[PDB]
Amino acid sequence: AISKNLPLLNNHFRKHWQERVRVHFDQAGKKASRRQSRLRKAAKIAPRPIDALRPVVRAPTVKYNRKVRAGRGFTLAELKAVGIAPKYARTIGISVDHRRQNKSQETFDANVARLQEYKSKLVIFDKKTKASEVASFEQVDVSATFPVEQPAPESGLRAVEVPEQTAYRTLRLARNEKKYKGIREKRAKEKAEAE
Amino acid sequence: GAYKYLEELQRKKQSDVMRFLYRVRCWEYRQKNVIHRASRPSRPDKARRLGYKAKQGFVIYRIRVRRGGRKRPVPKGATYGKPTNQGVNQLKYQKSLRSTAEERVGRRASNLRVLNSYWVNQDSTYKYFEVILVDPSHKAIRRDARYNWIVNPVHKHREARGLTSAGKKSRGINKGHLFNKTKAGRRHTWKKHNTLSLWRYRS
Amino acid sequence: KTWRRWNVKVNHNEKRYATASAIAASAVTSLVLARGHRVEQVKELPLVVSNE
Amino acid sequence: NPVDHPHGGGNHQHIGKASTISRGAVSGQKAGLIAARRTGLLRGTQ
Amino acid sequence: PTRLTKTRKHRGNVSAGKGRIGKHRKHPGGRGKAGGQHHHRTNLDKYHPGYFGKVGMRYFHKQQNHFWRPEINLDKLWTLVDSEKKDEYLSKSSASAAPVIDTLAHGYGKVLGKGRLPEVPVIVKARFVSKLAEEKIRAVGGVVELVA
Amino acid sequence: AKSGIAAGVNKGRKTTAKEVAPKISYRKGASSQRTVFVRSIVKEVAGLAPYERRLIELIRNAGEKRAKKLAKKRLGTHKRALRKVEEMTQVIAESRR
RNA sequence: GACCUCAAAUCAGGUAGGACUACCCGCUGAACUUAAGCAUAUCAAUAAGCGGAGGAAAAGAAACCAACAGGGAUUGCCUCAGUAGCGGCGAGUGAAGCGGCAAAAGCUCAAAUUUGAAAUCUGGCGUCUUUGGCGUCCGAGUUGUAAUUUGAAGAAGGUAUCU
RNA sequence: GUGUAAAGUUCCUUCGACGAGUCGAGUUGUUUGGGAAUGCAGCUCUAAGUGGGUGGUAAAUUCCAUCUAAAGCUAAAUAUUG
RNA sequence: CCAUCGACCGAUCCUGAUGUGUUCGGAUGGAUUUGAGUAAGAGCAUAGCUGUUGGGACCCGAAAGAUGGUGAACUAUGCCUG
RNA sequence: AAGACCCUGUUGAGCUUGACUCUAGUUUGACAUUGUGAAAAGAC
Numbered sequence A: 001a002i003s004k005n006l007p008l009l010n011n012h013f014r015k016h017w018q019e020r021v022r023v024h025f026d027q028a029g030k031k032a033s034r035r036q037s038r039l040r041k042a043a044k045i046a047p048r049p050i051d052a053l054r055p056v057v058r059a060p061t062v063k064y065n066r067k068v069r070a071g072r073g074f075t076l077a078e079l080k081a082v083g084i085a086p087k088y089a090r091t092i093g094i095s096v097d098h099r100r101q102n103k104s105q106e107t108f109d110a111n112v113a114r115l116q117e118y119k120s121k122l123v124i125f126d127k128k129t130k131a132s133e134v135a136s137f138e139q140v141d142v143s144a145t146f147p148v149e150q151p152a153p154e155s156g157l158r159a160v161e162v163p164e165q166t167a168y169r170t171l172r173l174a175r176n177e178k179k180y181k182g183i184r185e186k187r188a189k190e191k192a193e194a195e
Numbered sequence B: 001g002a003y004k005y006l007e008e009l010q011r012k013k014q015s016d017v018m019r020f021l022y023r024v025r026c027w028e029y030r031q032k033n034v035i036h037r038a039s040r041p042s043r044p045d046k047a048r049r050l051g052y053k054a055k056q057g058f059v060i061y062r063i064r065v066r067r068g069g070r071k072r073p074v075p076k077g078a079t080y081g082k083p084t085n086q087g088v089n090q091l092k093y094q095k096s097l098r099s100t101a102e103e104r105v106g107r108r109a110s111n112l113r114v115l116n117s118y119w120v121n122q123d124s125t126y127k128y129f130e131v132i133l134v135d136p137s138h139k140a141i142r143r144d145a146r147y148n149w150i151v152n153p154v155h156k157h158r159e160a161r162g163l164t165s166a167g168k169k170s171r172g173i174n175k176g177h178l179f180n181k182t183k184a185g186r187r188h189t190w191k192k193h194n195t196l197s198l199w200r201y202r203s
Numbered sequence C: 001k002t003w004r005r006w007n008v009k010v011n012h013n014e015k016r017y018a019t020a021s022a023i024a025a026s027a028v029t030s031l032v033l034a035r036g037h038r039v040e041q042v043k044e045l046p047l048v049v050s051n052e
Numbered sequence D: 001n002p003v004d005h006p007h008g009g010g011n012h013q014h015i016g017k018a019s020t021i022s023r024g025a026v027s028g029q030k031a032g033l034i035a036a037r038r039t040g041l042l043r044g045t046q
Numbered sequence E: 001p002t003r004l005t006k007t008r009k010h011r012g013n014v015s016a017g018k019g020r021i022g023k024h025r026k027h028p029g030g031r032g033k034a035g036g037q038h039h040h041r042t043n044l045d046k047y048h049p050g051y052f053g054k055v056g057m058r059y060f061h062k063q064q065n066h067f068w069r070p071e072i073n074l075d076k077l078w079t080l081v082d083s084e085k086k087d088e089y090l091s092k093s094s095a096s097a098a099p100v101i102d103t104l105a106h107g108y109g110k111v112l113g114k115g116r117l118p119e120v121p122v123i124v125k126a127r128f129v130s131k132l133a134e135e136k137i138r139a140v141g142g143v144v145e146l147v148a
Numbered sequence F: 001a002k003s004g005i006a007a008g009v010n011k012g013r014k015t016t017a018k019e020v021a022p023k024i025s026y027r028k029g030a031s032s033q034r035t036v037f038v039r040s041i042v043k044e045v046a047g048l049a050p051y052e053r054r055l056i057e058l059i060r061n062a063g064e065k066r067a068k069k070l071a072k073k074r075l076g077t078h079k080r081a082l083r084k085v086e087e088m089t090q091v092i093a094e095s096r097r
Numbered sequence G: 001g002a003c004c005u006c007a008a009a010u011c012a013g014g015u016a017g018g019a020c021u022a023c024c025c026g027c028u029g030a031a032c033u034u035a036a037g038c039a040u041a042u043c044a045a046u047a048a049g050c051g052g053a054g055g056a057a058a059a060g061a062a063a064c065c066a067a068c069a070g071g072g073a074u075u076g077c078c079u080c081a082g083u084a085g086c087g088g089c090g091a092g093u094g095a096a097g098c099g100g101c102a103a104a105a106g107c108u109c110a111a112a113u114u115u116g117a118a119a120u121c122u123g124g125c126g127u128c129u130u131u132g133g134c135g136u137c138c139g140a141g142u143u144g145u146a147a148u149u150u151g152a153a154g155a156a157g158g159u160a161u162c163u
Numbered sequence H: 001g002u003g004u005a006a007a008g009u010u011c012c013u014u015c016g017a018c019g020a021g022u023c024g025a026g027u028u029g030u031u032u033g034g035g036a037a038u039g040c041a042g043c044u045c046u047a048a049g050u051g052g053g054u055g056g057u058a059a060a061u062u063c064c065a066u067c068u069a070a071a072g073c074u075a076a077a078u079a080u081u082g
Numbered sequence I: 001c002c003a004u005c006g007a008c009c010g011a012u013c014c015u016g017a018u019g020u021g022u023u024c025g026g027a028u029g030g031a032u033u034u035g036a037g038u039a040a041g042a043g044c045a046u047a048g049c050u051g052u053u054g055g056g057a058c059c060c061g062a063a064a065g066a067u068g069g070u071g072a073a074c075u076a077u078g079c080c081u082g
Numbered sequence J: 001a002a003g004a005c006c007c008u009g010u011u012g013a014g015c016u017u018g019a020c021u022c023u024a025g026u027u028u029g030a031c032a033u034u035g036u037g038a039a040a041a042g043a044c
């Protein structure tokens, strides 16, 4: 059962695994049909775009802080700042997210900017609009026309400015302050109250 | 109105007034059939909160259900296997008494759809429930835009499939890390986690 | 069984290498004749013909 | 034979344990003298 | 392919290469890692010491993202400068105009100190830094700027 | 608000803060003039539960710690026991005035 | 003469049952087997047994995830990861958050005095331009049927002219 | 067009009802990767109103964060030896 | 590439500077100790033979165990009518 | 007729018991079902 110098393995095949095997023989067929569905859906509503406009959000988790991605929908405050009611925004290709909040300024500004760009490029037709102007427009890809752009990292040239305390010492002191904060402020009280 | 007062009063189940009412009504319910039609809800505010309306086509049934656990129904207590499976007493049914009440009432009134249910009373032998029922075939239901949905055949015997409030409770259908196993259906999630997924170009 | 391995992955760069090598081979008359093509009465390879 | 009765079997016919059975014994065990207060020939008054 | 296997070469030989005495049988010795403490101890103690037992403390609900901190050493740090302006930066960089290196935006958590820098001032932005890494950066006239 | 470095207390990047209008859902626990009125009437109609009466008597006899152990067993948690004991002492205080 | 509760009718009109098995929602539930023995464990929350659907079902617009510069209904794929963890800590077993992608869609009640007017609804009868419209008469309904609100709010008083 | 009507947007004032033998707790059995207890169910106890739940080591003390249960509907991407 | 004496990083034992939330900090120098480390990267991917582990697992073979059904036309025993 | 005797196998089964580990049933207590009065002892 156990023999010569080999890695010890973990092959989980002790249940009736052969009753539950999924082979994606239909990978190409599903690609083609998913493509045909996109085609039909786009032809149904032309020239209106298929994709609603989406916000730009920071990814959570200290591993993904640096990145920014597409979110679910614009906040109520972001829409308020551009003068668009939430129930009206849904009828003009703008996504809405009542759950996301705007605690800071940067993301709010970026999404207000996206909304203003989209509103500047938007043309709402009405009963007066003729078929010849409706035929003038091509179905625009919204996620390509309003892409999520990573802010560029700082580069180039700048003056060198050396603080007297090292970065390493700053980090060590910050760790020490955090670590002993609770017991030091307990000592501060019990010494004070005894005064 | 009065419904708020009834709501707050029904939360005082140990006051003298409520203890008296529960005693008298438990005796009365225990005198009638195990399943009987109720001419009206005994808790109209509670029934309203669960979807009842005082319209034609809304029906209330009462049922008592025997309390306690599930004795394993094996002859003479013999289970014929390993000691881990030898238990007969102290075993528990995985569905609640409320769901049993719903299912038995649904079996009796098979022309109707079970909407929801609520507790009404309790003694040491029985728990008493009232089951709210809707008639799919009544025009007062079929023409009502707030209740048309239950006419669709996908809601046939939703109480037998664990689709009522009590059923979705017992199935563990809730959001978050405490319901990882049952969130999307326990057996579906197990099947997904126990499926070997092979692609054409095997990585 | 259906879950036998049917398709095979090839590195994309190596596949491009083979494509380039096969294109280069098409300009070698000895290789084209060995391959069995009746290119005895063509002046030069590659054979390029006008866009008409 | 032993399958049939608690008294069955053996290379002679004999009961092999006390025939007085507890009142608290279970079905399949109550054969013999069930919860006997005494045994043997009755002598004297009762 | 099957035509290249030794099964083809064993055709016509009785035991298929498995021996007449030993006789390839079903599971002599048990299945899997059976007997790791009994009749396979001579394998496990030789080739997998440490296999049996418990060491250290448990960590319930460990989230690996808390511990993300990819490391970059000083000998590699100039790869992060734009490749088209690296030659120019090596010549023109001074105390008043030095290249900025945003290590976190390049996906790194800590600057370690293996290797040698070009003798050119740089400005290094990092979440964490080792003591020697900062010391070598300051020695060529540079600085480490902590970011979060 | 954040320190601007990756370690220590109050760590993290500094952003320009923006004030957020509180969500209406955050008011859930607040009492209203409707509910306070109705609950006071129901208490008059209903009266106290048997453990509540038994809990008054403990507090009147200066058995705070003894009333707290009973309230924790009856209600289940020490947090809920504390609130019920405070509630019942306000029941006694009003009774005298 | 009402009412409440409870009955009967070959009363007027409806409705349910049974079938099929690949997939679906639950209940109930093994042992062979592995552990080189074996009882916890494993096989397996599997087979068999029972109840209930559809073209999909189920789930679903947070009593969520997180701990970040924060994400934002549900579902699936890839990854996380054979990892954290569980385990005679043996044999074995084993998810989730983040990240990329497919697809994207949102909402409804209860709790509120219409109170200057039950404004609501099934049925019968007549009629028409009949998946229904109109008129009328019983009946249901105040122990609450409509309109109005659903937390992202929203209501009652004002508001600015707008749209 | 029965539009002195229905709706939307902005500002100001006062308000802002929000689901109970349920939540939650103990215990028993079962199950889970969930470990001083993951879900489910039985029995006993049984709430509150800035309250309640969660925050993966039991407890008390003080904070913080995040949602808003115990009522309900809903296409698509997913499955498919019929 | 090999033998050997060192140097560097982490764990362990000692030492303990300027300083201090006076209990933290850890400069500097040591130690028959320890690591699946460093000391001018070698890996990633596809394929092939052989070898390994889980799978029906080279092929055929138990005595057994479990779940759900079908039989008192033979025969055992009671009852009813001849 | 792949010994039915004998031995071996970490292969069984029928049977037994003061084997190991359990179990139907039964018995004993507590809590609930569960209310209304009075008296005597005890307790704060």
Ligand SMILES: CN[C@@H]1[C@@H](O)[C@@H](O[C@@H]2[C@@H](O)[C@H](O[C@H]3O[C@H]([C@@H](C)O)[C@@H](O)[C@H](O)[C@H]3N)[C@@H](N)C[C@H]2N)OC[C@]1(C)O
Residues within 6 Å of the ligand: I031
């Ligand atoms: C602290 N005292 C040290 C003593 O420990 C020793 O140093 C060892 C050294 O020999 C080890 O190094 C040893 O092992 C490594 C191996 C791990 O790769 C080899 O590369 C190296 O050639 C070999 N000498 C090194 N890994 C740790 C030091 N403390 O060297 C003598 C000494 C100075 O007295």
Ligand SMILES: CN[C@@H]1[C@@H](O)[C@@H](O[C@@H]2[C@@H](O)[C@H](O[C@H]3O[C@H]([C@@H](C)O)[C@@H](O)[C@H](O)[C@H]3N)[C@@H](N)C[C@H]2N)OC[C@]1(C)O
Residues within 6 Å of the ligand: I039
């Ligand atoms: C030319 N410079 C060399 C440098 O290349 C390097 O040499 C290593 C040498 O130290 C290693 O060898 C080392 O490590 C091995 C290892 C098995 O533990 C030890 O057995 C050996 O004693 C030790 N010297 C050798 N395996 C590779 C060379 N490139 O380190 C030593 C050096 C002199 O600085």
Ligand SMILES: [NH3+]CCC[NH2+]CCCC[NH2+]CCC[NH3+]
Residues within 6 Å of the ligand: G044, G045, G086, H031
């Ligand atoms: N499919 C397996 C059914 C039996 N369940 C046992 C697995 C979990 C055993 N408890 C693990 C230890 C308790 N945390």
